[PDB]
Amino acid sequence: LKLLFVEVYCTHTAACIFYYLATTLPPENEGYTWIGSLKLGDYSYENFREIDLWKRYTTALYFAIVTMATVGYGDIHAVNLREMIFVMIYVSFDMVLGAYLIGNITALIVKGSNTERFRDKMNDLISFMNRKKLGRDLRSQITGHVRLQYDSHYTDTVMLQDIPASIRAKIAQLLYLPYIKKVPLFKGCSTEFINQIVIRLHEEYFLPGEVITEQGNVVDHLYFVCEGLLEALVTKTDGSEESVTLLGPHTSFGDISIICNISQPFTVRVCELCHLLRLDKQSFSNILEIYFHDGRTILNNIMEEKESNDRIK
Amino acid sequence: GHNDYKYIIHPKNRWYKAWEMFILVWAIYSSLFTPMEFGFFRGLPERLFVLDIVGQIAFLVDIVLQFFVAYRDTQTYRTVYKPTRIAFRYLKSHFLMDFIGCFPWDLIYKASGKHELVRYLLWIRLFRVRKVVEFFQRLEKDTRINYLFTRILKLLFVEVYCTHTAACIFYYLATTLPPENEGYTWIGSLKLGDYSYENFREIDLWKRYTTALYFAIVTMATVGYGDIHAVNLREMIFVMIYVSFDMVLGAYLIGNITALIVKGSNTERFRDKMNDLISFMNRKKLGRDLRSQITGHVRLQYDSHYTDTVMLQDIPASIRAKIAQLLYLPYIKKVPLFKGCSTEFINQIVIRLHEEYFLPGEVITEQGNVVDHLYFVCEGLLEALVTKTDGSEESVTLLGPHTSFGDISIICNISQPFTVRVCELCHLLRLDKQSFSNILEIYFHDGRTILNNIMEEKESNDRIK
Amino acid sequence: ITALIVKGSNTERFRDKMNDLISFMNRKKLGRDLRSQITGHVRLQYDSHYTDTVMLQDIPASIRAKIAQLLYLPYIKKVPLFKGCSTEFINQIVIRLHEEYFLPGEVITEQGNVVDHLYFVCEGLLEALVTKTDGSEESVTLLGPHTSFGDISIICNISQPFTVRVCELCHLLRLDKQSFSNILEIYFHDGRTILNNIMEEKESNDRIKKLESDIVIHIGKQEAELALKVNSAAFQGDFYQLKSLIRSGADPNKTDYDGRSPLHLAACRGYEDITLFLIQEGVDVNLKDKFGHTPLFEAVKAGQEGVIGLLVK
């Protein structure tokens, strides 16, 4: 924008100076000036000193703007030696300044982010997927999840890796904290423990119908639903999976298997787009290796809370 | 919700896609004809009276269908199929402009006493180019065509439209002057060759349009021959505006192309590395075989696409897990370490896996280095050696495909016994020690079954003995 | 054309590297002499293709070892410091070295400094500036091509005997203390070959020959003190330090000033694992100390019946 404004000022000044150099010659020699000898169509700018001000300004600015884009129609052109020198200076300077404009626009475009980077990531991912000949539905899952990640700004976490663990912990305690309070799994805990639980959390968004974790699996991620609706399904030998509970907002799941040190009791399947905080089972464990008072208070809360659902109980 | 309210069309429904390709052609024609019928026609002649009417009808139906097609939400990201919800989207987003465009503006102009200001409303039909904008946006999603290439093609179409409209406006500005003063216009004084455009309002439509478009195109590339130039003050002002905007547009075109060349370099990166690396070999006179080894590694870097294995860290855990369950699971079965265990244990090994590729001659694990990863040789051959006190290395049994090495050291929780070497290109599937350890704790019976397989694998190779 | 120009100019990279450095130097308000030496050294680095190491960053260990054995190894094999070595040892150092080019009329190392890195001489002559009590210098050895410096201190566990002086432009070959120490513990007989060389090549060296008298003493107290560390670890119970110490070239057959073996100490203490490892070495089961105590009698004296079981075994 600064360079375009410099273009505006420079062309306006060039038009004014060019017409001025036309006026420097005495009127009797008007035939040797660029405007006094200018015959466009029928109108001949003969007594150019006595033509309407805006007609003269439009003519001079016409030339200036034309030369700025180097169209060089030639209809209006330098005739004098003073006009020759001024036009030389003007176009020589305008070359560099228009090259600066081109360079700034090109640098802007080169600094392509968001849709540009995501597009590149999509192309690389599509190539890799073709190499693995993955399931077309699973291919849709891959593409949909990363598209969601683009819209749900998953790459934000990469940026958050730059800011050190201190300010990062502050970002987490200023955002994840209410959501972690609402979850009843941590009904009673210490401030340090809850802060550590918040720090290691990672945001992730999931697409409806998908499987968060398979049943009978070594769960390595306790999740905390923030938005949307999730659910748990009881797969038997026949495959007649049965609903356990609609994992609504603030319904932590995977903690049962994690604390019980058992396999995933129920396949966790998605119903709507869900925002989930994530905590690696290992991380929750190491925080338990320190604040085990907190963990046994959980264990009591596990008793009383799981009493609610007979499937969970 | 698509059953809840019928007649609703899916956003990517097949018939709607066909109608999109049809209304896209009509939108291109309407946006490329409105400037023509505006500038070159002070009243559309009856010869094309049908062709305009049908045109509006073509969009009139589209005004109705867009009131039934569903739209994917930007909040729940889910397609919403409710006419109550669907209609509001049109009524707010673009219904006004499309509806104003659909009026018989030419007929209204001819039915109001030939008032030009009424004909100025014809430019509302230029907003039908939003269809072409949507088409280009959708094409950008397709990985078939580069995003920057789509950008440059969009900019080329922008130049096409801008030059066409500029030529039409230029001829219109020529027509605004009265015929008796036609000599003051840009066209009424044109004397190209022996042909003078004296009575320019009576020339054939295509000769006039080609002259105006010749001006527009030669000024688009700023060739500025000067044969056709602005003469009026309205013509001067319009040429200044067009020239400035086209300077900006051409700068953007050069920027898009330059960014496509700079950023969009895939094998050129390997070539750039080759440049200075070949300089290295040449200034140091490396053996041709060693030169081949280095070039093989660099090509390998672009041929192993480890980046295509790094991406999986970004895909979430479960979906990555199913990728593993469909690819690494055969390789997992091939392992003699697992052999016959519970399908669940095998599946958990499958889930947590990190595919890697290595280079011939380069070594992978070192003697005395605490094992941190459990490697399966899936497609390749691998050979370990142990440096003694004198220094000579101790050859061991080679690790051919469908085997698992480093497992014993992980089981004993001891450093890597022998410095292992990559003989050639190997599909070295990797399992972290901690993941395998947790999997073993959950599946203790499978763990003991592995222990049996382990004793058999111990007698299998005397170096593990 | 823009991409060709923006791919970076080898000089522009150098200029950018230099600028950044100079900005740091002025930011720290540095002095002219040091600035000139720094800028010159950056110069010699860039035109001698310092970035080759950067290029060598990506090609793996085997190929890097091969190019090393094709460039450095012919030059290293002509260095008498490593004549008599197993060729394996020489090639190993050759994997772990770094060429460096210094400006004429300079200095790297300083008499009495911590040696850290070790240096060879691929080409050029160097002057062994040994600062006296008054402050003057005398060169008792001229380090020409296929010579070495820094070795005297590392291999003999002293500090550098000399402030080395760069007589002219010189390409030398760097070997870190820590890596050299690794490769030196890997090999044993040729490490003693090093030591013997360091003695026999100390002939031209004269003030380093008084250093060499102290070096005779240094080999003496090195093996003695090494044995004392082995015995002290045996008594203390640091089995891990026992392993590391024996892997530092320690002789399990060495006894301390009381003619007491580390086996003896572990026997009287009862550390049957230290005893067992020194057994794996093969220390005499029937050795007698100055006081007549045998590892057997050492074990029986303190009632170390487990150690007695290992001993009778």
PDB file of C-alpha atoms in Angstrom, chain A residues 43-145:
ATOM      1  CA  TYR A  43      -8.894  18.727 -30.557  1.00  0.00           C
ATOM      2  CA  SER A  44      -5.496  20.354 -31.081  1.00  0.00           C
ATOM      3  CA  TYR A  45      -3.934  21.670 -27.878  1.00  0.00           C
ATOM      4  CA  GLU A  46      -2.757  24.836 -29.623  1.00  0.00           C
ATOM      5  CA  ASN A  47      -3.149  27.562 -26.980  1.00  0.00           C
ATOM      6  CA  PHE A  48      -2.301  25.094 -24.245  1.00  0.00           C
ATOM      7  CA  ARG A  49      -1.848  27.863 -21.671  1.00  0.00           C
ATOM      8  CA  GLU A  50      -5.530  28.803 -22.125  1.00  0.00           C
ATOM      9  CA  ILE A  51      -7.104  25.327 -22.040  1.00  0.00           C
ATOM     10  CA  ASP A  52      -9.334  24.291 -19.134  1.00  0.00           C
ATOM     11  CA  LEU A  53      -7.298  23.355 -16.074  1.00  0.00           C
ATOM     12  CA  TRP A  54      -8.806  19.887 -15.772  1.00  0.00           C
ATOM     13  CA  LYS A  55      -8.294  19.181 -19.479  1.00  0.00           C
ATOM     14  CA  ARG A  56      -4.591  19.948 -19.079  1.00  0.00           C
ATOM     15  CA  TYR A  57      -4.353  17.973 -15.844  1.00  0.00           C
ATOM     16  CA  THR A  58      -6.113  14.986 -17.399  1.00  0.00           C
ATOM     17  CA  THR A  59      -3.747  15.062 -20.378  1.00  0.00           C
ATOM     18  CA  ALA A  60      -0.618  15.350 -18.225  1.00  0.00           C
ATOM     19  CA  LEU A  61      -1.807  12.724 -15.738  1.00  0.00           C
ATOM     20  CA  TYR A  62      -2.792  10.483 -18.668  1.00  0.00           C
ATOM     21  CA  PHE A  63       0.835  10.496 -19.888  1.00  0.00           C
ATOM     22  CA  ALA A  64       2.172  10.021 -16.325  1.00  0.00           C
ATOM     23  CA  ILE A  65      -0.112   7.005 -15.576  1.00  0.00           C
ATOM     24  CA  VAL A  66       0.533   5.502 -19.075  1.00  0.00           C
ATOM     25  CA  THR A  67       4.340   5.762 -18.585  1.00  0.00           C
ATOM     26  CA  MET A  68       4.016   4.386 -15.018  1.00  0.00           C
ATOM     27  CA  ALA A  69       2.729   1.085 -16.528  1.00  0.00           C
ATOM     28  CA  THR A  70       5.112   1.645 -19.506  1.00  0.00           C
ATOM     29  CA  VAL A  71       2.173   1.304 -21.947  1.00  0.00           C
ATOM     30  CA  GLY A  72       3.824   4.084 -24.030  1.00  0.00           C
ATOM     31  CA  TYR A  73       0.848   4.653 -26.385  1.00  0.00           C
ATOM     32  CA  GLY A  74       2.912   7.542 -27.794  1.00  0.00           C
ATOM     33  CA  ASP A  75      -0.146   9.767 -28.439  1.00  0.00           C
ATOM     34  CA  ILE A  76       1.237  12.147 -25.748  1.00  0.00           C
ATOM     35  CA  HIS A  77       5.076  12.132 -25.799  1.00  0.00           C
ATOM     36  CA  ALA A  78       8.136  14.220 -24.908  1.00  0.00           C
ATOM     37  CA  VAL A  79       9.340  16.626 -27.603  1.00  0.00           C
ATOM     38  CA  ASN A  80      11.734  19.093 -25.976  1.00  0.00           C
ATOM     39  CA  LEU A  81      15.173  18.360 -24.577  1.00  0.00           C
ATOM     40  CA  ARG A  82      13.953  19.318 -21.103  1.00  0.00           C
ATOM     41  CA  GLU A  83      10.979  17.002 -21.595  1.00  0.00           C
ATOM     42  CA  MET A  84      13.309  14.291 -22.902  1.00  0.00           C
ATOM     43  CA  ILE A  85      15.506  14.546 -19.804  1.00  0.00           C
ATOM     44  CA  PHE A  86      12.543  14.604 -17.428  1.00  0.00           C
ATOM     45  CA  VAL A  87      10.891  11.610 -19.101  1.00  0.00           C
ATOM     46  CA  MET A  88      14.209   9.758 -18.914  1.00  0.00           C
ATOM     47  CA  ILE A  89      14.475  10.467 -15.183  1.00  0.00           C
ATOM     48  CA  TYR A  90      10.825   9.579 -14.605  1.00  0.00           C
ATOM     49  CA  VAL A  91      10.888   6.228 -16.385  1.00  0.00           C
ATOM     50  CA  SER A  92      14.293   5.310 -14.925  1.00  0.00           C
ATOM     51  CA  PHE A  93      12.981   5.905 -11.404  1.00  0.00           C
ATOM     52  CA  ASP A  94       9.636   4.270 -12.204  1.00  0.00           C
ATOM     53  CA  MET A  95      11.414   1.124 -13.389  1.00  0.00           C
ATOM     54  CA  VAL A  96      12.982   0.621  -9.966  1.00  0.00           C
ATOM     55  CA  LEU A  97       9.837   1.611  -8.101  1.00  0.00           C
ATOM     56  CA  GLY A  98       7.584  -0.697 -10.130  1.00  0.00           C
ATOM     57  CA  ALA A  99      10.118  -3.473  -9.651  1.00  0.00           C
ATOM     58  CA  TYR A 100       9.827  -2.760  -5.924  1.00  0.00           C
ATOM     59  CA  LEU A 101       6.046  -3.070  -6.242  1.00  0.00           C
ATOM     60  CA  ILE A 102       6.420  -6.398  -8.055  1.00  0.00           C
ATOM     61  CA  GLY A 103       8.928  -7.626  -5.481  1.00  0.00           C
ATOM     62  CA  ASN A 104       6.691  -6.714  -2.554  1.00  0.00           C
ATOM     63  CA  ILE A 105       3.665  -8.401  -4.120  1.00  0.00           C
ATOM     64  CA  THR A 106       5.749 -11.493  -4.904  1.00  0.00           C
ATOM     65  CA  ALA A 107       7.126 -11.565  -1.357  1.00  0.00           C
ATOM     66  CA  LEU A 108       3.592 -11.285   0.034  1.00  0.00           C
ATOM     67  CA  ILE A 109       2.472 -14.235  -2.091  1.00  0.00           C
ATOM     68  CA  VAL A 110       5.641 -16.201  -1.230  1.00  0.00           C
ATOM     69  CA  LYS A 111       4.757 -15.765   2.451  1.00  0.00           C
ATOM     70  CA  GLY A 112       1.838 -18.087   1.810  1.00  0.00           C
ATOM     71  CA  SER A 113       0.341 -19.594   4.939  1.00  0.00           C
ATOM     72  CA  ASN A 114      -2.901 -21.224   6.078  1.00  0.00           C
ATOM     73  CA  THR A 115      -4.671 -22.477   2.943  1.00  0.00           C
ATOM     74  CA  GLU A 116      -1.335 -22.620   1.093  1.00  0.00           C
ATOM     75  CA  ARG A 117       0.393 -24.824   3.681  1.00  0.00           C
ATOM     76  CA  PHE A 118      -2.706 -26.940   4.265  1.00  0.00           C
ATOM     77  CA  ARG A 119      -3.030 -27.467   0.502  1.00  0.00           C
ATOM     78  CA  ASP A 120       0.583 -28.649   0.343  1.00  0.00           C
ATOM     79  CA  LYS A 121      -0.032 -30.950   3.325  1.00  0.00           C
ATOM     80  CA  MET A 122      -3.147 -32.346   1.610  1.00  0.00           C
ATOM     81  CA  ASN A 123      -1.205 -33.050  -1.585  1.00  0.00           C
ATOM     82  CA  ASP A 124       1.637 -34.790   0.270  1.00  0.00           C
ATOM     83  CA  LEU A 125      -0.883 -36.744   2.371  1.00  0.00           C
ATOM     84  CA  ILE A 126      -2.893 -37.789  -0.702  1.00  0.00           C
ATOM     85  CA  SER A 127       0.286 -39.040  -2.365  1.00  0.00           C
ATOM     86  CA  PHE A 128       1.250 -41.059   0.718  1.00  0.00           C
ATOM     87  CA  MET A 129      -2.286 -42.466   1.015  1.00  0.00           C
ATOM     88  CA  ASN A 130      -2.150 -43.614  -2.604  1.00  0.00           C
ATOM     89  CA  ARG A 131       1.183 -45.287  -1.825  1.00  0.00           C
ATOM     90  CA  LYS A 132      -0.343 -47.193   1.099  1.00  0.00           C
ATOM     91  CA  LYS A 133      -3.553 -47.953  -0.862  1.00  0.00           C
ATOM     92  CA  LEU A 134      -5.496 -47.311   2.330  1.00  0.00           C
ATOM     93  CA  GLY A 135      -9.232 -47.863   2.659  1.00  0.00           C
ATOM     94  CA  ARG A 136     -11.196 -45.311   0.642  1.00  0.00           C
ATOM     95  CA  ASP A 137     -13.468 -44.730   3.640  1.00  0.00           C
ATOM     96  CA  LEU A 138     -10.376 -44.574   5.838  1.00  0.00           C
ATOM     97  CA  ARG A 139      -8.981 -42.196   3.218  1.00  0.00           C
ATOM     98  CA  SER A 140     -12.069 -40.030   3.750  1.00  0.00           C
ATOM     99  CA  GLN A 141     -11.379 -40.260   7.486  1.00  0.00           C
ATOM    100  CA  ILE A 142      -7.797 -39.040   7.018  1.00  0.00           C
ATOM    101  CA  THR A 143      -8.780 -36.157   4.740  1.00  0.00           C
ATOM    102  CA  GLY A 144     -11.765 -35.121   6.852  1.00  0.00           C
ATOM    103  CA  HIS A 145      -9.781 -35.137  10.073  1.00  0.00           C
TER     104      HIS A 145
END
